[PDB]
Amino acid sequence: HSSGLVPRGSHMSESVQSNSAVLVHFTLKLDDGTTAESTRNNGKPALFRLGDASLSEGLEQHLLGLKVGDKTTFSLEPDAAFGVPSPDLIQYFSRREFMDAGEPEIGAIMLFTAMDGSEMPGVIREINGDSITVDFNHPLAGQTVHFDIEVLEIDPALEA
């Protein structure tokens, strides 16, 4: 063998792979310095799963190769992060469709049920009589995002 290939010592991956589940701490900040999301704020670490389109490819590319205990800080522009916002994700509802959901209020985040029963938040953008405008774009669409990520564990095992 001429590869530099080495049998892996550990029972689990030693560095993040294309399909790893990764327990992390993270902070995600916007250009103005505000914190959009933090594991501190959530109260607990997050599970980042590579290889199933739950993460952007740009985030995945910065996680690949990291080992437990590694910290990385980096920024992503929208095309590598949460994309730019699309006018197609602005949608129109009748006020009566909110009959059981709560009064629409400008700027509120409301939850909506999709056809397959998964839930999606939407932000109330306009209220004009019977017509309610809702924006379903990702909340961080269009933003440059600043990540600070620390790898806690790779492929955590089920507990007995």
UniProtKB/Swiss-Prot annotation:
<dbReference type="GO" id="GO:0005829">
    <property type="term" value="C:cytosol"/>
</dbReference>
<comment type="function">
    <text>PPIases accelerate the folding of proteins. Substrate specificity investigated with 'Suc-Ala-Xaa-Pro-Phe-4-nitroanilide' where Xaa is the amino acid tested, was found to be Phe &gt; Leu &gt;&gt; Ile &gt; Lys = Ala &gt; Trp &gt; His &gt;&gt; Gln.</text>
</comment>
<keyword id="KW-0697">Rotamase</keyword>
<dbReference type="InterPro" id="IPR048261">
    <property type="entry name" value="SlpA/SlyD-like_ins_sf"/>
</dbReference>
<dbReference type="InterPro" id="IPR001179">
    <property type="entry name" value="PPIase_FKBP_dom"/>
</dbReference>
<dbReference type="GO" id="GO:0042026">
    <property type="term" value="P:protein refolding"/>
</dbReference>
<keyword id="KW-0413">Isomerase</keyword>
<dbReference type="Pfam" id="PF00254">
    <property type="entry name" value="FKBP_C"/>
</dbReference>
<comment type="similarity">
    <text>Belongs to the FKBP-type PPIase family.</text>
</comment>
<protein>
    <recommendedName>
        <fullName>FKBP-type 16 kDa peptidyl-prolyl cis-trans isomerase</fullName>
        <ecNumber>5.2.1.8</ecNumber>
    </recommendedName>
</protein>
<dbReference type="InterPro" id="IPR046357">
    <property type="entry name" value="PPIase_dom_sf"/>
</dbReference>
<dbReference type="GO" id="GO:0061077">
    <property type="term" value="P:chaperone-mediated protein folding"/>
</dbReference>
<dbReference type="GO" id="GO:0003755">
    <property type="term" value="F:peptidyl-prolyl cis-trans isomerase activity"/>
</dbReference>
<feature type="domain" description="PPIase FKBP-type">
    <location>
        <begin position="13"/>
        <end position="83"/>
    </location>
</feature>
